[PDB]
UniProtKB/Swiss-Prot annotation, chain A:
Native species: Homo sapiens
Top-level taxon of the source organism: Eukaryota
Effect of S65G: Phosphomimetic mutant that can recruit PRKN to mitochondria
Name the record gives this protein: Ubiquitin
Domain named Ubiquitin-like: residues: 1-75
Modification after translation, per record: Phosphorylated at Ser-65 by PINK1 during mitophagy. Phosphorylated ubiquitin specifically binds and activates parkin (PRKN), triggering mitophagy. Phosphorylation does not affect E1-mediated E2 charging of ubiquitin but affects discharging of E2 enzymes to form polyubiquitin chains. It also affects deubiquitination by deubiquitinase enzymes such as USP30. Mono-ADP-ribosylated at the C-terminus by PARP9, a component of the PPAR9-DTX3L complex. ADP-ribosylation requires processing by E1 and E2 enzymes and prevents ubiquitin conjugation to substrates such as histones.
Amino acid sequence: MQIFVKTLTGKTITLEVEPSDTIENVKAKIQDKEGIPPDQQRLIFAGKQLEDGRTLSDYNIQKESTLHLVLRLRG
Amino acid sequence: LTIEVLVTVDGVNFRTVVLNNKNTYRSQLGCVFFNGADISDTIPDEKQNGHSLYLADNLTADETKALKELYGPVDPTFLHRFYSLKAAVHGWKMVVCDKVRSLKLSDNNCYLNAVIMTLDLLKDIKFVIPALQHAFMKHKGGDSTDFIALIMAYGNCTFGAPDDASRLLHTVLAKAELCCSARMVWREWCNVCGIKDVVLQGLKACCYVGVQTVEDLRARMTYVCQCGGERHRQLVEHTTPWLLLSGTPNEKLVTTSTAPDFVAFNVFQGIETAVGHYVHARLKLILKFDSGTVSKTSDWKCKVTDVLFPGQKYSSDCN
Ligand SMILES: [Zn+2]
């Protein structure tokens, strides 16, 4: 299964994962594609922030789904 | 020579543990807190004999089970981090301006001020996790140490370190529920695939990340369907006690000579790639709460992040 993650710059990456994969593992895939640490990644799908305690199936995320990557601000 | 202590992880179930004065607490038992202080790397003394200790690791089977019921499913380092954060943030203070409580600036905690002050405006919310709800009720009572430390622990925040208010806010809200009804219905349609409604209920229907205005939330979207054809989406039903919209810091001019609809909002000051500063604001004039510093302005050039709207009662015929 392939999904899509859009950044703020504009470049859109494609990730090959499975419904079983959790958000913690999805962030690991982004780590190997952009170099951005999982600790500083915010994934937004369908207006909801994705938490590391749940998987992709918990958010009903599947094929051809588009995710939004936003960096963790430091205030 | 030897002492006995009472070990607990919940303050209700205790077990006796025998210790000598040969090795450290950590060596004999594990990471332990005594009246809030971590004494793991000290030698047991007669002065602590019979006293109660809070254990953070090397838990028994019973303690682990009670831990999961009390705090939910947490990582092995959670309890230590929570206990440690509690000790660290004990010196933090709330400033009270006209009954309104605001967290005083200290150790880069401004993002926490924005999170907490926003939470304080959200009616009919509660937490499922007993410890979190208990700390929440204490917070509303005037003692916020437990709640602050807990959400920092759940949010994996580090004492003294700058952090993201929106990220923490939605993390905390993901653990909460509404004490009333709420509903949000998206309608998607495509001439080939058909009409599809996406329903959200409860707290989930009161929060959205990606939009910061009611107008943009109710706007019709147009994109490409899975079949490759033209697909649309539009909000057709929204009934909430309140509405929290969150997005990236975008610069605008907020004025009260226009009579806005929103009740409150958070602002990120500084550049987004470096260490900035959060400020919480409410409209009652714009009441600004800068970590204990309170001021009023007619207008304000700022980069809004989270926005809080009143109750929604909306339906669209979608045409
Ligand atoms: Zn279609």
